[PDB]
Amino acid sequence: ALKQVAGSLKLFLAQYREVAASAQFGSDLDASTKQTLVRGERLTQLLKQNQYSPLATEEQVPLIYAGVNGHLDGIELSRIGEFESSFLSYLKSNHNELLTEIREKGELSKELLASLKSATESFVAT
Amino acid sequence: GEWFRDNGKHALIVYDDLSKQAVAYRQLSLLLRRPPGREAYPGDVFYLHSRLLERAAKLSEKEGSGSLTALPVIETQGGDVSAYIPTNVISITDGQIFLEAELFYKGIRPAINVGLSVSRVGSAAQVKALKQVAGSLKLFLAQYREVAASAQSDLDASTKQTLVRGERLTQLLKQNQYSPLATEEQVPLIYAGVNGHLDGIELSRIGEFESSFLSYLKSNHNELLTEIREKGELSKELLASLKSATESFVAT
Amino acid sequence: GEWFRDNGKHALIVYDDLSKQAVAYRQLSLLLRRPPGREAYPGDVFYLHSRLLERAAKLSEKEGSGSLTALPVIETQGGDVSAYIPTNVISITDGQIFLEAELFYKGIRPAINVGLSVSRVGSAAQVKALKQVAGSLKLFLAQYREVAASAQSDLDASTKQTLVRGERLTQLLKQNQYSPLATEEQVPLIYAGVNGHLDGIELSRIGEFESSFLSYLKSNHNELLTEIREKGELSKELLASLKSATESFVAT
Amino acid sequence: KLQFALPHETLYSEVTQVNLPAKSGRIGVLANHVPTVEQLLPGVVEVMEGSNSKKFFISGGFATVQPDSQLCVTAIEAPLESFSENIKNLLAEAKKNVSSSDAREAAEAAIQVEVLENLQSV
Amino acid sequence: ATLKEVEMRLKSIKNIEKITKTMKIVASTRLSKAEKAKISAKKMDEAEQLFYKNAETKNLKELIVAITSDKGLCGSIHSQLAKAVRRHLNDQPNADIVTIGDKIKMQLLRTHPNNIKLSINGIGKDAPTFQESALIADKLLSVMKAGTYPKISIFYNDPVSSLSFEPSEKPIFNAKTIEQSPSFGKFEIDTDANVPRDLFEYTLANQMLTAMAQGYAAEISARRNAMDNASKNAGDMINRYSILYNRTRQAVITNELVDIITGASS
Amino acid sequence: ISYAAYLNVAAQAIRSKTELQTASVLNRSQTDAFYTQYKNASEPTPITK
Amino acid sequence: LTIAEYFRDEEGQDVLLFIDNIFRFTQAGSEVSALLGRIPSAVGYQPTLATDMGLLQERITTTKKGSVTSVQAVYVPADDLTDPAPATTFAHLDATTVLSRGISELGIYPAVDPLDSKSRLLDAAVVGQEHYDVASKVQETLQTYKSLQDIIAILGMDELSEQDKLTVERARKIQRFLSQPFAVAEVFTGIPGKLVRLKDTVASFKAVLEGKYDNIPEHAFYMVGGIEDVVAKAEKLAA
Amino acid sequence: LTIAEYFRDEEGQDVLLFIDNIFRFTQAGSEVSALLGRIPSAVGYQPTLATDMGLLQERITTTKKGSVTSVQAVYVPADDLTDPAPATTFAHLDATTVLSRGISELGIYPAVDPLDSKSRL
Amino acid sequence: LDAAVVGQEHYDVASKVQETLQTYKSLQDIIAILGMDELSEQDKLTVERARKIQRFLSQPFAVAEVFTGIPGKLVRLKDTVASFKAVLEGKYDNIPEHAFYMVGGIEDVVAKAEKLAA
């Protein structure tokens, strides 16, 4: 499940720093580059984690899922931390059947994807 | 040197230089087949200096009040005070007078880099007169260095003043070789600098100003120099009288 | 090699290479437990190579005029000529032909770094003709690699020129492997460049120019080539002849 | 005095007569001319200081007779007899062909036609 | 603390140095070519704005055009000009804004996102030309309807010397504002074909070319100046790192030797 | 088209003999400037003016 | 190697000798050298490092009896190619594929350093003048780009010559075109491996150098086969 | 040097001694020291670097009888002036004459650099 | 340095201070070569602020009175936490750098800023 949602996260994050390098000499970027610069800056933010606060894959997956796809781009940067815990609580009360599924079946099908895609898109409007 | 110390008298000892002592010691240790450490010096190259320099001291009343004062000389390479031997000695002595090669080439001699120079115990032992006209000179000067380094982004108002005073005290601090000067010959020059009576005078003439100013003081206001010499302090009256004679000379 | 030298003849010796020979001698010395020094070399590794290399020599007329000429090879690591063995050999010898990957990858082959190569002997060993046309080559290329970082819009006609010239003179110095040129083939090529006959020729065509130009001189001007070869100098008549035959071809 | 000024080249910055092509009419600036402002359409321009007569070619711009009584000319491009058959009618057969059809750009290459006619005027 | 680090940290700066030192000469070649465009521009404007001086023309919503360029490395050209627009634009938080050159944008975009309705691009390469000045004017009339404004203002840097400059403001008057003037009658302008219409449109183009030419030569002087201070400042670090290099290199030879030595003793 | 821009077309017909067409003539007859209308933040296509 | 030699001499046939990792031979002898009584040589290695290596390497060879094609993985201590061990290994090889950290980090696999890798066979007499010219130009193009990268971090792109912009733009394509999914590598690529025939490679890169694909997006050269594959990938991204 | 001393001590002259090149004196002692089994010092120079240098230099001086004055050619390894060889040498140098191609390539003979060349005197 | 010991507010301040200082560090080379002008506004402000923190972290010890010329000040933890918290909150941006140098808490900055402005 984690493998799927973390597509080219590692290569992408490289493409991000390839660009966070070009941003240095006071550049101005085209639509693709300014966006991926925004995406990665938030992806980085989502990788922050407290000590003694480890997470289960079924909690990890939705976070990485929301991140890479861009359901976090139009959110103010300093609030990704409170997003992480609000959202995991939201999915525990509303769309809990989903998280239950990931823990047990360790995999995703179109049905799990679109449910979660529909579920995350929901939360974004707080 | 110690004989003087132990017999109620005072001795100054210059070690010129310890860098070369250390090198000789290294020669002996390697031929003695002692293991080379950092920069090939033996482990005891610190103890070499430390035991030597610990012998400098000021003694108690009971021990006759003698003193041995040490001025060890160290030679940096490429101006690096962080090398092994420099830092060893700095961790022994009570301060450093650092001399910059950069200042030296510019003609600023003595080339004392004030930022990097310090005396850890001497402030106590300073002659009051100097201490009084050295008000913050320590802080100010080595801080005019803040502006000076930045200077060459704005043609400022406030920080254009400190650039003109700074430059002056920098010349006042210059000094010809073989010409050590008495305290009472010193304090006026500094008073005249610190209170900005030089601000109007050009750089190229601060040299001539100083010789001509001391002549003036000797012939005309010798009573006052004598008072500086004999009491070592500046009474409000002598302070005010000194202001008087300063303004007069500058005007002409 | 020395049999040739001692008997009125001339031998060339290539030692490919001395890096590897110094490694071999180090093996022997370490295993014989002689004392090691820098990079673990024995204190007589300089003596090994100088002993070896001073044997190349140009003998007096009394002694038969024989000669031995040496091309020792040294491999550096990361271009570090301050390494122990390159140091030894650089200083023993009479000059350096310095090769570089950078140049190599740019297509400049042989990848000789002009500004780092030298022959202390110099002119004394050059055919006079080549010395005549090359005089300035030394110069333009020198002035080229100084203004290089400019090769990246707004530059006066002075610099645009300097850049045009050098590009082409650089290109002229490229050469295929296994294709050494006769002196009489070299000088007219160098002459054309040195004197500006290549300026108007797009940079990619300097190669085919060289080839064509040579063959053209061979069919039409075998006289100029024969003189260059047979006389070793260029008279003002040869120079003038060369000038004409060049423009003739460049136009055509 | 006269001041002639192109943005890339200042030409003329005491005079007796100057000749401009104004709104429609071709004014010959008299010595004491009442201050007047008139646009310059494409055409030739002459200056005088003795019996010195010499023309240029004007793209367009403004001419202002000033309260100092001096003249001021400004065009964008300017000689014509000394800056010139082979040069002229070159992309003039490419002028009508890119006239052209329809977008709205037709208007910019319609500004080429009327201009070339009154450029090969003399 | 290792040779590799110090040697390559040196190789970053040695190029930074050589490069900043090149664009000071490329800046100096560009210097005269642009002192020339500034002279030709002023001279043209001097003939045009002299009429406005005589007509004693003043100003009875707003458009602000601020001019610099795309490229940095020119000191505080973009900054204290942006700041001049901040000082003036306090009186008018509703003045529409067109910016010329991306750097004045990122300055004015972060301070007032909404006022910027238009932004121009790829400007400070070569000297400004009339085409640029014109087509920018054209679009100020097109989508920005420059005609339909009470007051117009151009912002640009005037070059005073080769060491300092001053962010300046100069006004633009429209068809209407030219007519209703203290001294329109001084001139015998023909009141027939739309003249004030043109003298405004022609001036919009011109007074910008003249603002850009001055802003450019201010920029070019500021580059050659900032780069001189940089190449100087770089060399200083190169000097300080050539010294550290040398220490480390010596240390490397010694430390390597001590291992050989310990190894040999046993 | 406008009085400034109109003049320019008659300044590029005037501009376009190859021999007197010196280097700083071809420069003046070109431009790499893109206009972008900026709403709210940004807006539409950047077009080569 | 003893096994390998036997096939070469008494099977009279083309043997293939794969060694991963030959560095470990020099390391091993190194680990016992002090306890064998030796004074150490430089960088900690044995005094016999080179002659040790000749004895091994000079056996790994084609003789007149039979042919051996050997491929040896060679670790490079701390990426330092000048460390005595790999540095003594170079001169035993007819072809040296040099892998690079700076390339791997750019997401380019195999991370083969296109400039630093060499072959005895890159020679017109062998590969043909065309092949040789293509390789030569590819290399000049990349070097020019490697050169210019110093500018492209301080001045950006904009101060670049027309000719040079074209080069740099072509270079970044060529650089990516040199990547390939491996069949053995699918696990780290999620991309079905590709094999590309030599004649295609030459044709493909030749074509790129002439500029017959400057109109095509960058990402379309990355991690694909030959020029067919690149034209396919461009259409998919266009949809 | 011994030959030079005889002209001073017995003939009373002011004598020139040229040493080309002083660095090769150092390196030789570095090499002898290594053959003698002596543990090397910093940068691989002999532990006796300074005294080896002193034993040569201190003999070049002015007596009451004359002087031996010495012009010594100085190589700088790695162009690093803090290298123990130049560093030790410099300790004994009273002046430098700096010959520059940059002075030569302006056709100035001798090619002495007036800004570079420095003297204690 | 852990929220479960010092409280989240303390932690958060310490860390943002640390992020701020770190930004200046990553920049030093560029500040020294190319000056302040070649920073983005974000950066310029962070650099401007970091230097105020830098200096605010300095403190006159009582035992170095001879070298400071100034009496030894001492700051209660709770005051350090709050004082720094406020600087980050952009509450003291208009203040010149010099007013944070060699003082105690934030009350002392206010004081020295007015001392300079007279």
Swiss-Prot record, chain A:
Present with 41500 molecules/cell in log phase SD medium. Disulfide bonds: none annotated. It comes from the Eukaryota. F-type ATPases have 2 components, CF(1) - the catalytic core - and CF(0) - the membrane proton channel. CF(1) has five subunits: alpha(3), beta(3), gamma(1), delta(1), epsilon(1). CF(0) has three main subunits: a, b and c. This is ATP synthase subunit alpha, mitochondrial. It is found in: Mitochondrion inner membrane. It comes from Saccharomyces cerevisiae (strain ATCC 204508 / S288c) (Baker's yeast). Mitochondrial membrane ATP synthase (F(1)F(0) ATP synthase or Complex V) produces ATP from ADP in the presence of a proton gradient across the membrane which is generated by electron transport complexes of the respiratory chain. F-type ATPases consist of two structural domains, F(1) - containing the extramembraneous catalytic core, and F(0) - containing the membrane proton channel, linked together by a central stalk and a peripheral stalk. During catalysis, ATP synthesis in the catalytic domain of F(1) is coupled via a rotary mechanism of the central stalk subunits to proton translocation. Belongs to the ATPase alpha/beta chains family.
Curated annotation (Swiss-Prot), chain D:
One of its GO terms (molecular function) is proton-transporting ATP synthase activity, rotational mechanism. Keywords: ATP synthesis, CF(1), Hydrogen ion transport, Ion transport, Membrane, Mitochondrion, Mitochondrion inner membrane, Transit peptide, Transport. Signal peptide: none annotated. GO terms for cellular component: mitochondrial inner membrane; mitochondrion; proton-transporting ATP synthase complex. GO terms for biological process: proton motive force-driven ATP synthesis. It comes from the Eukaryota. F-type ATPases have 2 components, CF(1) - the catalytic core - and CF(0) - the membrane proton channel. CF(1) has five subunits: alpha(3), beta(3), gamma(1), delta(1), epsilon(1). CF(0) has three main subunits: a, b and c. This is ATP synthase subunit delta, mitochondrial. The chain holds residues 33 to 158 of 160 of the full protein.
UniProtKB/Swiss-Prot annotation, chain E:
CDD domains: F1-ATPase_gamma. It is found in: Mitochondrion; Mitochondrion inner membrane. Keywords: ATP synthesis, CF(1), Hydrogen ion transport, Ion transport, Membrane, Mitochondrion, Mitochondrion inner membrane, Transit peptide, Transport. GO terms for biological process: proton motive force-driven ATP synthesis. It is a peripheral membrane protein. The keyword Transport applies. One of its GO terms (cellular component) is mitochondrial inner membrane. One of its GO terms (molecular function) is proton-transporting ATP synthase activity, rotational mechanism. Its main location: mitochondrion. Disulfide bonds: none annotated. The keyword Membrane applies. Changing S164I: In strain: D273-10B/A1. Changing S265F: In allele ATP3a. Changing T254A: In ATP3-5; dominant suppressor of the slow-growth phenotype of yme1 strains lacking mitochondrial DNA. Gene3D superfamilies: 3.40.1380.10. NCBIfam families: ATPsyn_F1gamma. Mitochondrial membrane ATP synthase (F(1)F(0) ATP synthase or Complex V) produces ATP from ADP in the presence of a proton gradient across the membrane which is generated by electron transport complexes of the respiratory chain. F-type ATPases consist of two structural domains, F(1) - containing the extramembraneous catalytic core, and F(0) - containing the membrane proton channel, linked together by a central stalk and a peripheral stalk. During catalysis, ATP synthesis in the catalytic domain of F(1) is coupled via a rotary mechanism of the central stalk subunits to proton translocation. PANTHER family: ATP SYNTHASE GAMMA CHAIN (PTHR11693), ATP SYNTHASE SUBUNIT GAMMA, MITOCHONDRIAL (PTHR11693:SF22).
Curated annotation (Swiss-Prot), chain H:
One of its GO terms (biological process) is proton motive force-driven mitochondrial ATP synthesis. GO terms for molecular function: ATP binding; ATP hydrolysis activity; proton-transporting ATP synthase activity, rotational mechanism; proton-transporting ATPase activity, rotational mechanism. The modification Phosphoserine is found at S104. Its main location: mitochondrion. The keyword Transit peptide applies. Keywords: ATP synthesis, ATP-binding, CF(1), Hydrogen ion transport, Ion transport, Membrane, Mitochondrion, Mitochondrion inner membrane, Nucleotide-binding, Phosphoprotein, Transit peptide, Translocase, Transport. It is found in: Mitochondrion; Mitochondrion inner membrane. The keyword Phosphoprotein applies. GO terms for cellular component: cytosol; mitochondrial inner membrane; mitochondrial intermembrane space; mitochondrion; proton-transporting ATP synthase complex. It comes from the Eukaryota. Mitochondrial membrane ATP synthase (F(1)F(0) ATP synthase or Complex V) produces ATP from ADP in the presence of a proton gradient across the membrane which is generated by electron transport complexes of the respiratory chain. F-type ATPases consist of two structural domains, F(1) - containing the extramembraneous catalytic core, and F(0) - containing the membrane proton channel, linked together by a central stalk and a peripheral stalk. During catalysis, ATP synthesis in the catalytic domain of F(1) is coupled via a rotary mechanism of the central stalk subunits to proton translocation. The chain holds residues 270 to 390 of 511 of the full protein.
